[model samples]
Target: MKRQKRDRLERAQSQGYKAGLNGRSQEACPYQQVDARSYWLGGWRDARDEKQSGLYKLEH
Candidate 1:
């Protein structure tokens, strides 16, 4: 179960790196090897979850 999810993410990252190699602006996790949240929920979402949810909320 978990292996499949990991494989998908790795494949997506490979695609992202290929796009980068092909001269485009894209990234798998947009930064580096980070938490699952960054690979899934996204960067800012992870930031908000860690630092300031109140400031990062959508429809306050």
Candidate 2:
């Protein structure tokens, strides 16, 4: 893949993961492109699972 494509998707994935880790809703995805959004949601799902299984949690 091209460098630009990889960078964009990676960034999107990071953003999604962070959001999910912070307990943000899945509807918060910011990417307009289908591929970017898919990457974003995929990362979000993984992070969400991590959070749910008590691997990571937010503090008060």
Candidate 3:
């Protein structure tokens, strides 16, 4: 289950996955080819061409 799982998902200071992609799948999207990293964490994304917005300062 650790294909891309961090030991945890947050820092003791601020919050949210410190830098571990928030325990997400760093794996590229298999459904299609992306200019960058395929899709978001769970294959959920606004567009395959882009990635997360880091609204919470969290890594994409």
Candidate 4:
């Protein structure tokens, strides 16, 4: 079950959507990766954290 969730998260991130806790909708979290590697760290890296911390949020 955990592995499946992780795989889904990875796939979503690759497509530029950050998956949130409890399978929440893609809520426009500010952090993004131009490549697949960083995308894998989406929720674990807390894209929202950097957003709330005043990091630059790209407009897309």
Candidate 5:
């Protein structure tokens, strides 16, 4: 019953990481909930760091 919340957060985080890897701006975040948005931002920050620090595109 409560799984939907975690699912949404997971989905948001995954999408946010994808968006960050694709160079999408933070302004494009679509989540309205505080929890989801922070989770997404966390993913985005990780992606941004990956893109900045290492070979993120060597496999893709």
Candidate 6:
């Protein structure tokens, strides 16, 4: 599998295990949004090819 797919699968499996151990459903985890935001800022770029291009504070 591609690295992206493998990384996603690994994260999913790890999250599942943690959720089970914590007696929480995957959907109830607050970490999901944090992880998503972190991943987005790390991996996404805009037309300018800059990660901070679309950041809220950077907008006029």
**Top of the candidates by lDDT:** 5
- For each candidate in the order shown, give its overall lDDT on alpha carbons: 0.45, 0.77, 0.29, 0.47, 0.79, 0.42
lDDT of 6 by residue, 1-60 (tens): 556744654464455444444534445343335553343322322212342344658546
Q: What TM-score would every model get versus the actual structure?
A: 0.33, 0.66, 0.17, 0.26, 0.70, 0.35
> Which is the better candidate, 1 or 5, if ranked by TM-score?
5
lDDT of 2 by residue, 1-60 (tens): 556777877888888898787738777776646886688888888898886778445653
Poorest lDDT segment (10 consecutive residues) of candidate 4: 16-25
TM-score of structure candidate 4: 0.26
Residue 26 lDDT in candidate 2:
71
Arranged by lDDT, best first = 5, 2, 4, 1, 6, 3
Q: Give the clashing residue pairs of candidate 6, or none.
A: none
- Where does the lowest 10-residue lDDT sum fall in candidate 6? 39-48
Candidate 1 error regions (>4 Å): 27-60
What is the TM-score (0 to 1) of candidate 3? Answer: 0.17
- Give a tens-digit lDDT track for model 1, residues 1-60: 656757655554544444433424333344345543334334334443444454675765
Ranking by TM-score: 5, 2, 6, 1, 4, 3
RMSD, each candidate, Å?
10.1, 5.7, 12.4, 10.5, 5.5, 11.7
Best by TM-score: 5
User: Ten consecutive residues with minimal summed lDDT in candidate 1?
Assistant: 19-28
Report clash pairs, candidate 4.
none
- List the candidate 5 regions with Cα displacement exceeding 4 Å: 55-60
Model with the higher TM-score, candidate 2 or 6: 2
